[PDB]
Structures are given as C-alpha cells and as structure tokens.
Amino acid sequence: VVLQRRDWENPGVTQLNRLAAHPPFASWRNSEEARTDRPSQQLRSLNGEWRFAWFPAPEAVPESWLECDLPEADTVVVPSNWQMHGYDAPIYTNVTYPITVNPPFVPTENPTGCYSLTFNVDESWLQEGQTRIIFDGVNSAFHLWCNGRWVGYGQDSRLPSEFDLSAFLRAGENRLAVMVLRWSDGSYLEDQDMWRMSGIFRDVSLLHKPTTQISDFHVATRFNDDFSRAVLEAEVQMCGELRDYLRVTVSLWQGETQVASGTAPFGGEIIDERGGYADRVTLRLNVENPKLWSAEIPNLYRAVVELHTADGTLIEAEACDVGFREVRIENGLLLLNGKPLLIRGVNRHEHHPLHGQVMDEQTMVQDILLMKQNNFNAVRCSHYPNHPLWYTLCDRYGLYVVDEANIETHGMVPMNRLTDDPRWLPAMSERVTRMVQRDRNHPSVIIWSLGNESGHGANHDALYRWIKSVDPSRPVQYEGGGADTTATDIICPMYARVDEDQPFPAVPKWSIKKWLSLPGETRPLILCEYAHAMGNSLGGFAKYWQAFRQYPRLQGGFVWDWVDQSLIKYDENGNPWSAYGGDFGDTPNDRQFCMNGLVFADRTPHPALTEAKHQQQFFQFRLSGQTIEVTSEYLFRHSDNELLHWMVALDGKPLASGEVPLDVAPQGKQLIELPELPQPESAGQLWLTVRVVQPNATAWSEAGHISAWQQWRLAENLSVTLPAASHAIPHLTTSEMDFCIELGNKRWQFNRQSGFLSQMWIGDKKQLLTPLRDQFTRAPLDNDIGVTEATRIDPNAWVERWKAAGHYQAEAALLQCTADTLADAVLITTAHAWQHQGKTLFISRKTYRIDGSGQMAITVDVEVASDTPHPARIGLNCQLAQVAERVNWLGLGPQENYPDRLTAACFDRWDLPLSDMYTPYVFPSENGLRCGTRELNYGPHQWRGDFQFNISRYSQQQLMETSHRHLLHAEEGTWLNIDGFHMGIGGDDSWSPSVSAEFQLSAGRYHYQLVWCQK
C-alpha cells in the first residue's frame, strides 16, 4: 500500500496514525524529580548508532529491509543529516525550489534514507501503560515500521512526530525501520533560504505514559494593573477512564519554596448546551507580588502538574518552567509587563559547519552567551520551530523569542499561490497549530509568526484568527504580502530603510519612519529582518538605532542574521576549509548568499558584531562641561552590577582615569561630575572614553565584562611650534628616465615615464616592490556585487557600474612630471589622467616635497568626472618590501571599521599583529580598513595625516580574483592601501545599491595630504 498510495505527493495527507501534539512531556512518577527537572526513567533516548542505507528512490528499497538488516547498510550516529555523511550532496538554493515546481509532485528520483535500530524494551514497559516513539525532526517525510509492521507516516521537518508502539512491541529485542524521503509535498512549504538537507536530524526518544495520563496542559498568567498580583491559570486534560477519585494538583515553586497550590477533580465549567469537558480541569492559583520574567531578569517559577487519586497516590507528574509576564499591544506599542520593548533582535538558523542542521546543547549555549554578551535581547526562529531545548535555554537565560511556523513558499509564482489555495489549508494549519500546541507554555515565546515569504493568502487570515482565538496572550505577526496585512498585529517589514522609500508595486517598503504614520495606521513596527550582515556589511546600522530610540512606535528589529551558513570541506591534504553554494556540485545554487552572519560558522565574530553591540547598548551618554549624564534603557532592572570607568588621553597617552559605580533606576538618569583635569602643555587632542563594566560574573558573562562605551573630543591644542631647522639639503639627480633625490642614507626615485615614486632606499635597501600609485577601486564587497553574475548582469549593482565605466581597466596617462630644487627641499610635481575609451574618469595632481629632515610631504588633489559612477575610494597604494610583525596606529580601532560602520571603534593608540589587520571573510573582498587615522607605523615607516588605511599580504587584485579565503596566498611583502576617502559599505540589503548618499564619494574634487618618514 505504501508505494501505491504515494502519500508524499499528496498535500491532503500530512500524517497517518500520528498522536496529538502537546507541550514537553517526561511522565515522571515522582513529584520531586518533576520539580527539580531531573532525568525521567520513563523518557529513554534513542540517540545512539543506527543502521543506514541510501537509495535513489523509494521504489529501490527491498522488501527484506522491513524484516531484517541490510548487510550493505552502514552504522551512523543519529541525529544526523545524511548529506553530512557524504551519501549525497547538500544543495544551497535561495528562492528557486530545488525541485521542479509541479505541486504536489516531486522528482521520481527521490533520495531515500533507510534508517533502522535494534533495541531492548523492558517487560515492565509493556505490562502496563503506553509506549510511544518521538521523532523530534525528520526531513522531510517518513514511514515507520516496528518489527516488520507498518506504524505510520509524518510530514513537517521541524515539529515532533509521535506514534504509539504499545501494540507493536515485544519483550527483549525489537527493530524500528524508518524510510525517510528527501522530497515530499511538504517540500513546497519548506523553501527557506538555507542548505537543503534530509534525514533524522533531531532527537529520537521513547516515552512511557500510564493509561490514565495527562494528555495536555496550558499555563496562563494574568495580572492586575500594577503587576502586584497575578492569577496562574492551568488547564489540564486527561486521557483514559474518568473516575470520581481522580484529582489534579498544580503546585508552583520558587526554588525549594512552594508558593501556591490548587487541587480539583476533573470536570470543567459548562461550555454549551451539551455540558462541559468531563476530561478537563482548570486550576487557579493566586500569586502575590510575583517575580516577573523578562530578558533583563529571567525570573522563573516551577509548575508541577500531578495526576493523582483523592487519597494521594501519584499516577504521573508533568512540569514546566513558568515566567510571569504579560505581552500586549496597547495604543500602538508592544508592551512587556506594561513597558514598551526595544527589540535588539537577531534571526538565527539552526546551523553547524560540521553537523549541518543538527543542534547540540553546547552550540545553543555558545550562541546565547555571545548574543547576550553583544547586547541582544531577542531572537527570531527563522523560519521554523526550533529544537525543543532552545526554548528552555531562552526561558532560563532570558531572550525574547518569535516562534515561527515552518511555512515558506518563496519560489511560487506569485508568492501566495499555495497560501491562497484552500486545498493547501490543511497542510498549513498543522504547521501552525502543532507549533502552538508544543510551545505555548514557554515564557520566552512572546510573539507567534505565521511563517516566511509565502505572500499573503486567505490561509494566513484563517490561521492568524485561529491563534488569536486559542492564545490571546501573544501577538501574531507575519511579513508576507507587504508587512502590514490583516494577518499581522505588528508592521514587520524586511529591509525597509530608515529614511528612503522603496515604492515597489503592490508590496512597497516605505521608510520605517513614514510607514508608522500612513493614514489610518496605528500598529507598532518591528523589522523581522534588517541590516543584512553579508560579508563586509552593517554600514548604516547606527541610522536604524537612532530612529528606534527617537520614535516610540519603532520598537527595533531582528538582524539578518546570526551565523554564516558555511560548511566544512577538506582539501587533498585533509585540511578544512569553509564552503558555500555550488561547492558540493549542487546546481543551480546561490553561491555565497548562504553566508549572512554576524559570526563565522565556528562562532568567531565578524567585525560587524562589535558595531551591533555598541548600537544595542543599554546605557546612553551625554557630556556637558565636566558632567557625564548616564541614561538607563533597561525597563525593569536597576544597574546593580555596573561601574563606569572613565579615561582621558592625549593622542593615545593616558593623562587621568577613574571609576564611579552606576546607580541608575530603569529608564532613570545619573549625573557624574568629572574631577578637574590638568591642562597638558603638549599639543594634540584630548579624548574622553567611558566604559560600563560588570564587576560580577553573571549566568551569561564573565567578571569584568564591558557592556557599553562612548567617546568624546575634549580640549584640543593645535600645534604651532615649527620643527627644528635641518642642517642638510636633499640633492636632486636627473636622468632621462628618473628623478632621484638623496639625503643621508635615504634615496627616493621618481620614474619620469610613469610619473610615480617607483623606489625608495634606506641604506641602499629597497622599500618598494610595486610603485606608489593612485587607486580608485576596491575588491568588491558582497554589497557591491548584489545579484549580478556572468550569466545575467545586473547593470544597477555598484561593481557593474564601476566595470562598465572602466574603473578597473583605466590606465594612468602621464600629463606632467617636473622637479624643482628649493632652499631646503626638492619638489616633485605630477599630473595624471585615467581614461577609458576616450573618457577621462579621474585626474590626480600631486606634489612631493622632500626636505632636509628626511620627511616626504605628499599633497594629492583629485578630480572625478561628475557623470562617472562615484568611485569606491580615493587613495594611494603600493607593495612594501618589508613584512613586519606588528601594525601600530593612532586612529579608530582596534577592529575593522568603515565610514558608515565606525561608531563602535574608538580613537586611541592601537597595536596589533599584522594578521589581525586582515578580516578572513569566506568570500574575499576589500577588508580590514581602519578610519580616522592620524599616524600609522609599520617597520621603519611612519605615515601621518588624516586617512583611512588597510594593510595585509593580499593585493586588491588577488582579493578580487579569489572566490574562497582558503585559496588566498600571502604575496611578497605587504600591500598598503592609504585612502584620503573611502566609500561606505552599505548593507540595508545585499541585492541592491544600499550605500547612503552621504557616504558616496560624489564631491567631484578631493584633497588629502600625507607625510611619509622613517620612524
């Protein structure tokens, strides 16, 4: 019947013989074990080694496999994705379905995973009660056999599928057989922008419940106006024979203290003309002055639900963590416990570079710790219900969660083709309803989401209302069909910009400030996705945060996204490297578009993470005279683990410091009076730096954790003292091909045919490998590239505009090269034009003044044609002969920063190893720039001025030509790029130009000056 019915090509069949969904169960038989959340003897893990065989189609699976093991099969760890074991390729596609769009049909060649396990079942489990199997995650559909007999079928890759094995099992040894199909009608609802994998990728377990059992329980907490009183309401459902002696006790615990308890027999209130639920009971417990749950302080109680006899014999106990909190939208504001939230969110996929989509406790905890350490308070489950432990950890560590149904139909045309079709309503309904049934008791879940990128259809409206009816405690949101449809309580756009409108037909992305006040609009606005963090990105992040703080109804958003979806591959030498779309022979694919994270796949931060941390700070600062004003953005907590350290430095040299404890009420202010600072006679800029330090370790951070910082310029004393007059005069030597300048053991050589400094000598040792030349281009960032390819050019992308204009091909033509001997200097004057097919793109006019002190002053004046696309940079570059260990600079740092992403960086004296001056983005690009630099030191060289720079062993050319970081090779010497000006990196999205006008190099004329000398 199995091969004949083909239930995996039928959206009307999403399961066969599957048990009802419910909150996490363990069937404790001891109340104390339930209270403490210790392991249950009734919950057995089948996370061991299973037997696995791969087949090209279900028709290729032999009938013998149902009865006994296949000898050709292998022994593999479960949970796993089989692509991670090498049985077939993981596919990275974004929008386009990985299968031909022909619903409900899938390919006849449908990779089939045959899993099996031989295991012991104790007699006691079969004598009394019910033994069920729980598959927490099977991608994407499966049939189940027990001892040769067919048990059932399940779809939806991201919610548990449970089956009763009571009648199927025997004492001693048993055998399970699972046929997992890669593709099903369920795949049409699983078109998330992520690696397409398959297998039994979440926990497998056996659960023993008594015949008379708790089958469901719901916990609600309601409050008075000031949250000084609460009522906990617990609805409990039973299965089995109803009896007068049966009771439920719900008890509430704070540590080892019982705070409240209620006991009742079964039999609910009258509901309609036919009576009530005889198999249900609702317990109501009063709680005075409840400790409230939030991401700031995740106060939890423990609720134990005991099913027992009137006389006090326990039948079973279930339990959950309870967080007392109220989520509501009032007057257009999303409120938690009566206060307006500011969502410092991030989207997070379940991804591991080695294990694929299998989650483990260590990685989950690693992620949560890093998130909170970087000032995140919220996570969106993009785009499916998560592994059950995630919600437990979010409950306990304190993060707000958007729980999202496993529904994405992005690749349909139009996007709502399935979601507006009532024939697809049953399949959609189960992905929504079974999520709510599972997760409704977790305090961390504050918002339900109906899925992602499935347009807006009538099915969404129906399911929106279903949730509103069954669970009024949480707003429902959904972005599809224009982000403000009738299926959402929150305006939740993706990549809507701060000030700029994007008026797409039917689904415009208005400026977020403008969206709020459209006629008749009253809802809060929280971006489900913003600040696309692909590669060198997060340009303009500060602009969002300024808007969020200014506008009450702009209540934040979720960054896209947490972690690069890169996968480990191994080279011929067995060395690991990071791979993206297409690296597994997967085609069609979307290349590096799977890597959009604030952290690398191994959880090493990208530079953008620090910009996020700084902008998401919970303390705001203002300076006035000697007074620092600290404002708390905490809604609930006082600053009881915070000290402010301050430091004043003159051009990186510390002058004074101190510390003051923070004593700021939530939303309150504290004034801090700095002592009298001694006026330094020495020239330069005084800088004030403040940082908030946490003296005590927390559950999420170490002692000494820095949570916030800010910098200000104080007094500046401009230098007016003339440098000591030199007693030496540089000598000019002229040939047909060179102007040469000599002073002591130093020589400069200017090539008269090229017009550039071609060489410099210190004690007859060459300093350059490549001449010092103007550069107007950069190895394109992911944001410069967008969706352009060789097969289909996007003419609007910055890289394509630069290419078409000839920016990369343009050759310097010499206009002028003269030398003059002065009183105490030699002056070299040059002029160059960069032209492409008759069009002059840029003109560079320079003077080089070499004086008797050995210093070379370079003055650069550049003209840029108004009608050429604005250039990526205006600067100089050269390949130095020296490879030195350290890079020392006075400027913004220590991390990589760009003009539209430098708020997190601080002005100071920084000293790093050379390797830290390169950012190992998996897809190579321009990287490692530091802005606002006044002094740069490298080996014997010093450059002074006001410039941006990067420095590394890789040329812009090599970065541009190399598609993977592991294929980069250190070049001879060091490539130095010193920019007078550099274009913004953008990142509002990564598929259209996103660099804001103020960060484009559009001024037409540019001036900068540098002094090059020996340190």
Ligand X SMILES: O=C1O[C@H](CO)[C@H](O)[C@H](O)[C@H]1O
Residue 596 as a binder of Na ion (CB under 5 A): the answer is: yes
Where in 176-215 is the site for Na ion (CB under 5 A)?
193
Q: Give the Cβ contact number of residue 105 at 10 Å.
A: 16
For Na ion, the binding residue among 597, 924, 932, 980 (CB under 5 A) is 924
Active site residue 453: yes
Nearer to a copy of itself, 276 or 312 (CB): 276
* Minimum CB distance to Na ion, residue 740 (Å): 38
Of residues 15 through 44, those in contact with a copy of itself by CB under 8 A are 15-16, 20-24
Size of the site for a copy of itself (CB under 8 A): 111
Quote the distance between the C-alpha of residue 348 and its chain's center.
6
Is cis: bond before 588, omega within 30 of 0?
yes
Does 642 interact with ligand X (rule: CB under 6 A)? Answer: no
Q: Which of residues 276-295 bind a copy of itself (CB under 8 A)?
A: 276-278
- Is 584 near a copy of itself (CB under 8 A)? yes
Contact between 349 and Mg ion by CB under 5 A: the answer reads no
> Which residues fall in the annotated binding site?
94, 193, 408, 410, 453, 529-532, 589, 593, 596, 991
Paired with 223 in beta bridges are 230
Query: Binding to a copy of itself by residue 272, rule CB under 8 A?
Result: yes
The single residue of 162, 306, 529, 926 carrying the catalytic annotation is 529
Nearer to Mg ion, 16 or 369 (CB): 16
Shortest distance, CB of residue 989 to ligand X, whole angstroms?
8
Q: Which residues contact 373 (CB under 8 A, 6 or more apart)?
A: 613, 700, 701, 705
Q: Which of 185, 350, 439, 453 touches ligand X by CB under 6 A?
A: 453
Q: Helix, strand, coil % (nearest 5) of the chain?
A: 15, 40, 45
Q: Restricting to residues 967-986, which ones interact with Na ion according to CB under 5 A?
A: none
Closer of 193 and 439 to Mg ion (Cβ): 193
Q: Identify the residue whose tokens are 């034009």.
A: 833
Instruction: Take residue 412 and report the two structure tokens written for it.
Output: 């349909």
**668 contributes a contact to a copy of itself by CB under 8 A:** no
> What's the CA gap between 319 and 200, in Å, rounded?
27
The interface with Mg ion within residues 269-298 (CB under 5 A) comprises: none
- Interacting positions 92-111 with ligand X (CB under 6 A): 94
Q: Rule CB under 8 A: is residue 242 a binding residue for a copy of itself?
A: no
HSE value, Cβ hemisphere, 13 Å, CA-based, for 830: 26
The residues in 144-203 that bind ligand X, with binding defined as CB under 6 A, are 192-193
Residues from 394 through 413 that contact a copy of itself (CB under 8 A) = 406, 410-413
Contacts of 857-862 with CB under 8 Å at 24 or more apart are 857/1009, 857/1010, 857/1011, 858/1009, 858/1010, 858/1011, 858/1012, 859/1007, 859/1009, 860/774, 860/980, 860/1006, 860/1007, 860/1008, 860/1009, 860/1010, 861/1005, 861/1006, 861/1007, 862/774, 862/980, 862/1005, 862/1006, 862/1007
Active-site residue among 350, 404, 430, 453? 453
**Which does residue 1004 touch among a copy of itself, Na ion, ligand X, none (CB within 5 to 8 A, set by kind)?**
none
- Interaction with Mg ion in 179-218: which residues (CB under 5 A)? 185, 193
- Which position among 404, 529, 564, 782 is part of the footprint of ligand X (CB under 6 A)? 529
Nearest to 425, CA basis, from 465, 475, 459: 459
Pick the closer one to ligand X by CB: 531 or 843.
531
For residue 77, give every residue at least 6 positions away whose Cβ sits within 8 Å of its Cβ, in sequence order, or none. Answer: 49, 50
> What residues between 67 and 96 interact with ligand X by CB under 6 A?
94
**DSSP letter assigned to residue 473:** T
Among this protein's residues, is 926 annotated catalytic?
A: no
Of 924, 931, 854, 856, nearest to 891 by C-alpha is: 931
Smaller CB separation from a copy of itself, 386 or 948? 386
For 695, the 3-state DSSP assignment is coil
Query: Which class for 353: exposed (0-12), middle (13-18), buried (19 or more C-beta within 10 A)?
Result: buried
Does 13 sit near Mg ion (CB under 5 A)? yes
Residues 464-493 that bind a copy of itself (CB under 8 A): 464-466, 468-470, 480-482, 486
Residue from the set 452, 767, 956, 974 that interacts with ligand X by CB under 6 A: 452
Minimum CB separation of residue 202 from a copy of itself in Å reads: 22
- What is the Cβ-side half-sphere exposure of residue 516, based on CA atoms within 13 angstroms? 21
Hey, which residues between 170 and 209 contact a copy of itself (CB under 8 A)? none
Query: Considering the complex, what minimum distance in angstroms separates the CB of residue 961 from Na ion?
Result: 7
Rule CB under 6 A: is residue 494 a binding residue for ligand X? yes
| Listed residue (560, 511, 518, 520) closest to 538, CA to CA | 560
Residue with tokens 């062993």: 953
Contacts of 167 (CB under 8 A, 6+ apart): none
- H helix intervals, 15-61: 31-36
Residue nearest to Mg ion (CB): 410
Using CB under 8 A as the binding rule, the residues of this chain from 502 to 531 that contact a copy of itself are 504-507
Which lies closer to Na ion via its Cβ, residue 215 or residue 347? 347
Comparing every residue's Cβ against ligand X, the nearest one is 193
965 binds, among ligand X, Mg ion, a copy of itself, none (CB under 5 to 8 A by kind): none
Concatenate the DSSP letters of all residues of 503-516 into one string: --SSS-B--HHHHT
Asked whether position 560 contacts ligand X by CB under 6 A, the answer is: yes
In whole angstroms, give the CA distance from residue 756 to residue 777. Answer: 18
Q: Which of 185, 203, 321, 586 binds a copy of itself (CB under 8 A)?
A: 586
Strand partners, 751: 738
**In sequence order, what are the residues at sequence separation of 6 or more whose Cβ sits closer than 8 angstroms to the Cβ of residue 674?**
626, 627, 628, 646, 658, 688
The annotated binding site for Na(+) is made up of: 193, 593, 596
Residue 494, contacted partner among ligand X, Mg ion, Na ion, none, CB below 5-8 A by kind: ligand X
Q: How far apart are CA 635 and CA 812, in angstroms?
A: 59
> CA 235, 241, 245: angle at the middle one, nearest 5?
75
Residue pair 356/579 in contact (Cβ under 8 Å)? The answer is no
Q: Which residues are catalytic?
A: 453, 529
Interacting residue ranges for Na ion, rule: CB under 5 A? 193, 548, 554, 593, 596, 642, 661-662, 924
Interacting residue ranges for ligand X, rule: CB under 6 A? 94, 192-193, 382, 452-453, 494, 529, 560, 596
